[PDB]
Amino acid sequence: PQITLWKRPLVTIKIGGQLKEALLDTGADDTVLEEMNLPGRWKPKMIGGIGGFIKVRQYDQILIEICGHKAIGTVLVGPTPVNIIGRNLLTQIGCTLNF
Amino acid sequence: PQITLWKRPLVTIKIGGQLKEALLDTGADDTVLEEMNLPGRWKPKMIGGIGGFIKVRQYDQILIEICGHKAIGTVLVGPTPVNIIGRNLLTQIGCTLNF
Ligand SMILES: CCOP(=O)(COc1ccc(C[C@H](NC(=O)O[C@H]2CO[C@H]3OCC[C@H]32)[C@H](O)CN(C[C@@H](C)CC)S(=O)(=O)c2ccc3c(c2)OCO3)cc1)OCC
Residue A43: Cβ-neighbour burial (10 angstroms; 0-12, 13-18, 19+): exposed
Phi, psi of B21 (to 5 degrees): -105, 135
Between the alpha carbon of residue B81 and those of residues A16, A72, A80, A86, B64, the distances in Å are 32, 28, 17, 17, 20
Q: State the number of CA atoms in the 13 A half-sphere of B18 facing the CB.
A: 12
Q: How far apart are CA A80 and CA A50, in angstroms?
A: 12
Q: How far apart are CA A74 and CA A24, in angstroms?
A: 16
Q: How far apart are CA B13 and CA A99, in angstroms?
A: 15
Q: How far apart are CA B84 and CA B56, in angstroms?
A: 13
Domain that holds residue A34: 1-99
How close A40 gets to chain B, by Cα (Å)? 25
Give the residue whose CA is nearest to atom 50 of ligand 1.
B48
Count of the separate structural domains present in chain B: 1
Contact A63, A71 (CB under 8 A): yes
Residue ranges lining ligand 1, Cβ < 6 Å: A 25, 27-30, 32, 47, 49-50, 81-82, 84, 86; B 23, 25, 27-30, 32, 47-50, 52, 81-82, 84, 86
Which residue, A80, A84, A51, is CA-closest to B81? Answer: A51
Resolution of the experimental model in angstroms, please?
A: 2.0
* Experimental technique for the deposited model: X-ray
Q: How far apart are CA B9 and CA A95, in angstroms?
A: 12
Name B74's Cβ contacts closer than 8 Å, sequence gap at least 6.
B30, B31, B58, B59, B60, B61, B62, B88
Q: How far apart are CA B71 and CA A65, in angstroms?
A: 35
- Between the CA of A18 and the centroid of ligand 1 the distance, in Å, is 23
Give the start-end residues of each E strand in chain A.
Answer: 2-3, 10-15, 18-24, 32-33, 43-49, 52-66, 69-77, 84-85, 96-98
Chain B partners of A69 at a C-beta cutoff of 8 Å? 99
Q: For residue B14, how many other CB atoms are within 10 A of its CB?
A: 15
